[PDB]
Amino acid sequence: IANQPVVIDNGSGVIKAGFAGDQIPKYCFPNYVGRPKHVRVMAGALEGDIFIGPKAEEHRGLLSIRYPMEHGIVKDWNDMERIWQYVYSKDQLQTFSEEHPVLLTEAPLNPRKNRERAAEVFFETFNVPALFISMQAVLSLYATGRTTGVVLDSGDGVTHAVPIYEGFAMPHSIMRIDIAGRDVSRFLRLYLRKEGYDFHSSSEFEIVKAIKERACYLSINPQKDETLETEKAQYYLPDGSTIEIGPSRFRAPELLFRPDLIGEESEGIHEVLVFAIQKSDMDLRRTLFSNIVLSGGSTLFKGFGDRLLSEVKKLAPKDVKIRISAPQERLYSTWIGGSILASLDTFKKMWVSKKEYEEDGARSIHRKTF
Template sequence: MDNFGEFLTKNPIVIDNGSGTMRAGLAGNDKPKLQFDNYVGRPKYKMVIPTKSQPDQYLGNITDEQRGMLKLQYPINHGCIQNWDDMDLIWKYCYCELQVSQKEHNYFFENYNTPALFIAVQGVLSLFASGKTTGIIIEIGDGVTQIVPVFEGYSLQYAQQRIDLGGRNITEYFNYLLRRSGYYFHTSAEFEIIKKIKEKKCFVSLVNQGDDKNYDTRGIVDTVTLPDGNTMTLTFEKQKAAEILFNPSLIGLEYTSISDLLIRSVQKVDIDLRNTLYQEIIISGGCTKLKDFPNRFLNEVKKIVPKQQKVKAYSPENREDLCWIGGSILSNLASFKNMWITKKDYEEQGERVLLKNSF
């Protein structure tokens, strides 16, 4: 690409760079072509029988057998990139898998000199994908929970809320509960096994059950077969793991609950806007796919607001991909071409152009 005009003839790449999951694809598609755990795997052991060459890193959809031989490291923690080298490897992998030409590939990754860029808050894109211009979005990912209010297309940034709490915390707490029940998982590969079990088996209790002894385990006993053939019995752990979203003190965090977080955001906006926002709550993010989460969250919000206040929440079936879909739709619009931040803009205005032109 020699200029921005040529760039506009290309199909933009949309990346949802989550703490736990990477989603990438081309603008205009209805779902990401790539979706995989956002980590880099490296061999834990030395190869003593040289039957075939062993890669230095494993990326993408790593098989269960490969995972057991690897140390898995996430480059992003609570929404912040901690390891730029590993992040670079994952971005390069995305470009190769999306079959971007080698010329474009090198151009993007040489000192991050992309021809044009646009950065958006996940919640805003989720709202856009929902076909709305007004609403308040609760976005719960692997590492971060965000509350983003938007009114008639305007992002009310002063009222946004964020806490470092998400799906990875639930997995860690689930692992802790399993240890208390006599099941021990130590390695990064075993942590991923726990994560998959959490996604399939855990659910959100419709009410706060309090202490472990108060959990009604009738009808929820579950047996899981582990990769080595052993079995594990789950009871109250399936319910209690996600309770940290509504009571972060269970894991020693002094955050408010996610329902209180939404109320705090609404209370920061003009009083004339609050009624509308309460009736346009959008639930988004992979963590919210846990069974009964939307109902519990709505119930918790209703407990706090005045009785006469109507509260409505929308939880699209594809809400784990909602952010990426919003980016795909937005960047494919003809009217969007004026919103790109070009390399020339950056060279002339510096970092302030990123704050000015992104949302």
């Protein structure tokens, strides 16, 4: 027995937290730690060397930004502990961690040590009554309400196509690549450098991320738009200066469909989806093609749906209906799924209890997650 479970979808880009049963995640904030890089000289300056959440965004020019997660894998565990502490602070969730079961999310095919260390942190440092490390794609499909389909979740750190049959994620058909929104923004930074506009600072990488979110689109025909004269839309920087983007506007999100633009010999996002579908059973391929669900932030590019549909039709067999679903709540689909799962009474039978972790350890999460 414990309080209402707390859902924490910890992405590489933004963490989304709330209590189970809420319609949307009420507590969303970027997943980075900001530390001041300048010299504090006077009394009355900003307090604390660690800035997380909207306090980091308000003073963004003052801070060096560090991302703990990279490609869905926690690289700095002290920063991850700080961020999860902030999730429980008086600014977010206003509650003690010793009272609420947690439903953490983890991207598929992650390292085992990542899940083990996450459970160790959540059971030792935060002393949670219970824990359940879920997978993002199956939760997104639960949020959509369907039971069978393919979830092509493309987040900040990792993109992956996961087919689910009657609620069970087929584990031998999961396709994953590490090219995601952060890679697209790094590519955009490189192209802006090739256009004369140079950004170095970790705080200016957030300006590059904003440029990606604001003025970038996917052209239906890359070669046709490539040869034509560009329009050079102008973007207003935070300081008031302007920059003319031009060809970098559409070649930056092209990285999702062509990783070879950065020398990676990995599949494209359309190839990820189609190979996940074609690696599954021959009986399920028709219903998997007829049920494709987009998710994550990187699926919000202008013209993403039409471009992916064209690519999948190019790769898919003929006489097979293709229906890519792009719900409005793509950013919070996986969190809404975690909230739906945690509301059920069956979730009581799913979590690893605190005593179970105390007596077993990593094996408890290893059997219970799978």
